[PDB]
Structure formats: C-alpha cells, structure tokens
Design an enzyme around this catalytic site. Structure first.
Site, short mmCIF file in Angstrom:
data_model
loop_
_atom_site.label_atom_id
_atom_site.label_comp_id
_atom_site.label_asym_id
_atom_site.label_seq_id
_atom_site.Cartn_x
_atom_site.Cartn_y
_atom_site.Cartn_z
N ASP A 92 4.19 35.86 8.00
CA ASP A 92 4.45 36.95 7.05
C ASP A 92 5.31 38.08 7.63
OD1 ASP A 92 2.24 37.73 8.70
OD2 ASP A 92 1.73 39.28 7.24
N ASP A 95 3.20 41.14 15.64
CA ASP A 95 2.29 40.10 15.13
C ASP A 95 2.91 38.70 15.05
OD1 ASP A 95 0.57 42.39 14.55
OD2 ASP A 95 1.63 42.58 12.63
#
Ligand code: 45B
Length: 248
Positions: free
Chosen positions: A129, A147
């Site tokens: 994402d 991330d």
C-alpha cells in the site's frame, strides 16, 4: 539498545499499530524516529511475522528513497523500531498545504518512486500500500517510502478488492492513482460510500479535469488499466515521454 538510551519528543503521527515519535540518541544527540508497536495488538491482527518480514527486508534492502530501519528492540509489552527521520514529513500533509502539485514536482516524485519500486521488485519485494500517508520527505525534498506490510479502498487495485490473484502490478496501479491525486488534488475513484468506490474502482470509472495535460493523461491511463498485464513496466514508466519531458 533500550528505551532509556533515547530521549523521546512529541509524536509525529499514526495510531492503529503504533505511534511514531521524534527521538534523540542520548550519546550522540542525533535525531531519528522511533515507532512503538504493541505486542498484544500485533497478535490480534496476526501480523507478527509481517513485522519480521520488515526486519529481514531492512537488513538487505537499502535505497535512498526508502526509510532505513537502523535497529529494533522490545520490552515486556512493546516492540520498538529505530527508523530514519524524514524531516519534511508526509506527502499527505504537503498535499493538504499545496492542494495539488504541479507537473514537474509530480514527475520527480513518480520517478523517485519508480526507481524505488524497481529496486524493490528486482529483489522479489512487492510493496502493498503506497499512499500519501506512507510516503515521507527527506531534507532535500526527496520521496522516502516508509513501511511495506503490515499493510480505505482508494489505492487498492481491482484484483485485490475483487479477490483475484495479484502481482507486482498492484504497485503500478497505485503509482497511477498516486500520480492522479498529485496533479488533481483528490484520488480518481473518490465517492461518498464504500459501494460506489468499489464499483468505480472495479469498473475503473474516472475522469480528468481539463487542465491535466495529454502526456499525464496517457501515463495515468496506462497505469490504471483493469487488466494488470496491460499495465506498463517500471522501465516504461521511467522512459515515458511525460516523465522525460519533466526532467533536466
Ligand atoms: C511544513 C512543516 O512545517 N512541516 C511538514 C508537515 N509536518 C509533518 O508532516 C509532520 C511530520 C514530520 C516528520 C515526519 N517524519 C517521519 N519520520 C520517520 C517516520 F517513520 C515517519 N513515519 C510516519 C509518521 C507519521 C505518519 C502519519 O501520520 N501518517 C498518516 C496516517 C493517517 C492519516 C494521515 C497521515 Cl499523514 C506516517 C508515517 N515519519 C512525519 C510527520 C509538520 C512539519
């Protein structure tokens, strides 16, 4: 390492898995970021192995447009991540300030991303994402990806929401959505309800404001093809005329 080795500052944001705080190493007074993840909270999600996937990833993967994880440690109830500090903050916030980026700024961001994502893929790593709230800014205004996964429908491709097999092409879709939002100010499949966004993403119903130029239209339209195989390679994104038009 341990919590007593650092001076904690204000929080920088987030909330669900962990807040991320300004931190200073007591010895060097060097600035860095510190994420606090809760062990029980991680166990309910069952993402503990995905946190390990990150630590394993970060011992191999190094790229100027990807946040370095320096180290990690844990006490009785928490897992701490010693991250690099992007002093200019999240792209999410810049987009709120400037409402929309211009072509030259967007084109640079997308290149930095395509180079980053190209590196990731070549070492068998798909980011899940990419979105403005996971994209940070360096001291020279450069894009930095935080991330990976541990990983709103707005940036998900049709294969993921429709429950299909997925590939590294999911990241190419995201790049398209990310390019559109940068130029126009809002994501292309924005609706009032889950049901609309799902429908719109599923069917790829989106239009362009008159100001978006032909070149940008083209690149985005290539990236938001329903058929993943029909979407371009990151090679082709870096060699797109609009990208190599907006570069020195
Ligand atoms: C112009 C100006 O004065 N600014 C720039 C705007 N600004 C900020 O963006 C605050 C800010 C400043 C620095 C950082 N740096 C950074 N360093 C390391 C990190 F690991 C890191 N990770 C984060 C930190 C926060 C977030 C975050 O809040 N994301 C988010 C989640 C849900 C909704 C909205 C958002 Cl932005 C996401 C990732 N952030 C993150 C945020 C305040 C200062």
């Amino acid at each position: 390492w341990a919590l007593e080795d650092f001076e904690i500052g204000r929080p920088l944001g987030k909330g669900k898995f962990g807040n991320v705080y300004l931190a200073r190493e007591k010895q060097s007074k060097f600035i860095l970021a510190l994420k606090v993840l809760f062990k029980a909270q991680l166990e309910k999600a069952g993402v503990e192995h995905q946190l390990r996937r990150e630590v394993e990833i970060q011992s191999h993967l190094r790229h100027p447009n990807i946040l370095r994880l320096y180290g990690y440690f844990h006490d009785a109830t928490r897992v701490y991540l010693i991250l690099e500090y992007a002093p200019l903050g999240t792209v999410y916030r810049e987009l709120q300030k400037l409402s929309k980026f211009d072509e030259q700024r967007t084109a640079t961001y997308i290149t930095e991303l395509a180079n980053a994502l190209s590196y990731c893929h070549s070492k068998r790593v798909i980011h899940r994402d990419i979105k403005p709230e996971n994209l940070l800014l360096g001291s020279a205004g450069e894009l930095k990806i935080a991330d990976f996964g541990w990983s709103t429908l707005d940036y998900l491709p049709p294969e993921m929401i429709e429950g299909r097999m997925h590939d590294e092409k999911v990241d190419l879709w995201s790049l398209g959505v990310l390019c559109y939002e940068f130029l126009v100010g809002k994501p292309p499949f924005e609706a009032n309800t889950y049901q609309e966004t799902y429908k719109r993403i599923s069917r790829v119903e989106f239009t362009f404001p008159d100001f978006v130029t032909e070149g940008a239209r083209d690149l985005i339209s290539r990236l938001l093809k329903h058929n993943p195989s029909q979407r371009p390679m990151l090679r082709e994104v870096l060699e797109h005329p609009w990208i190599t038009a907006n570069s020195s």
